[PDB]
Design a protein around this nucleic acid. Structure first.
Lengths: 203, 193
RNA sequence: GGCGUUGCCGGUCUGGCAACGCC
RNA sequence: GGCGUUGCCGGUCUGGCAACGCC
């Protein structure tokens, strides 16, 4: 049924979430919010709740909560970035989204927006925490949506057996520059695993 | 012989085309002419000609005696200085950017000079950040052999054996894994063979 | 408090401990 | 011609090809 709304007025759950998020936002004003898995395992762990996600979206739809890909924020929370930095975060999200399977390098991005590495790192790290970007290595960050789409492609490729670097590159219409770091990242988070000199998809 | 005339021809040809290379790679001089001739005897052929003062022999390249690369006098000095910094720093070599900063060099000029030393065999590229002097790497491989003789070793134990730090040792070990000197098994290494 | 750099440690990661810079 | 950069290639660089800059 996916679950809509229930009756048990133990809204002391929402009270405990507000407390935790308020506490998190005053401590971490330059973070997007509390990790959804952290809120999961701190207040809704022992209760075998698959409805925790349905609960999150309900409060979201009420306008009580901002849901990012892996962080949750009280509605009304704004990180304490400068207005220039707030605009940059939007502009970085867009550039990485549009570039997709051919993301710009850290150095290209720093030059483009005329930022020092220190500030760029801080901004990208924010987007990584939020789940908009995923760090493949120190040079390459990928938009979440782009990465999910690359993984779908690779999963279908690997359904017929181990694949090489060239075969992944052909399936993604990409280049070795982009694909080797991607595949090394996918080994690290255990999406892929090396078999001989090729890879298969595990989980 | 013969052979020598073919060699002088080959090297004069190489030097005039590549006046900013240290010389022709030894295994190219071999596969090009003395490929039917075995590995041994070819070594003795080069060392014989080197004792006669006819060839300059480097770790991986050969040059006719008298050949000087067409670097500027400033660059020639730099190359001596670079070789020295790396030799003395040994198992804690400077990073590429550290060296670019201390010698006040554009990355492309530093690259040109390190590439020459790496071609010649004086330096070995461990990774983008770290070059090692040849002698430093040779001695470190000896330490690694000693360590491995008692059994498979961890990163911490190799750092102990080199009196070093993890920052320097891990890149060394990853390099030695890529050239198949060592092999990694879980969090241990052995020396292959 | 936070954000970052560096060093060392522990196989390794926005990891632990410490210096420093910044807010 | 070379040196470098970037791109692409072949699992990889003591590379190959192409464009650009410099000589």
């Amino acid at each position: 049924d996916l679950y809509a709304i229930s009756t048990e007025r133990y809204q002391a759950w929402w009270q405990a979430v507000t407390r935790a998020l308020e506490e998190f936002h005053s401590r971490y004003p330059l973070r997007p919010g509390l990790a959804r898995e952290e809120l999961r395992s701190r207040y809704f762990s022992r209760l075998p709740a698959r409805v925790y996600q349905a609960l999150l979206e309900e409060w979201s739809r009420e306008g009580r909560l901002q849901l990012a890909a892996n962080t949750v924020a009280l509605a009304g929370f704004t990180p304490s970035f400068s207005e220039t930095q707030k605009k940059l975060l939007k502009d970085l999200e867009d550039k990485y989204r549009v570039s997709r399977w051919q993301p710009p390098s850290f150095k290209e991005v720093a030059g483009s927006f005329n930022l020092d590495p220190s500030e760029l790192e801080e901004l990208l790290h924010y987007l990584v925490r939020e789940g908009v970007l995923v760090k493949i290595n120190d040079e390459f960050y990928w938009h979440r949506q782009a990465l999910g789409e690359a993984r779908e492609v690779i999963k279908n490729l690997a359904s017929t057996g181990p694949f090489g670097l060239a075969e992944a590159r052909d399936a993604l219409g990409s280049s070795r520059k982009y694909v080797l770091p991607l595949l090394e990242y996918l080994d690290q988070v255990k999406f892929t695993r090396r078999v001989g000199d090729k890879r298969v998809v595990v989980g």
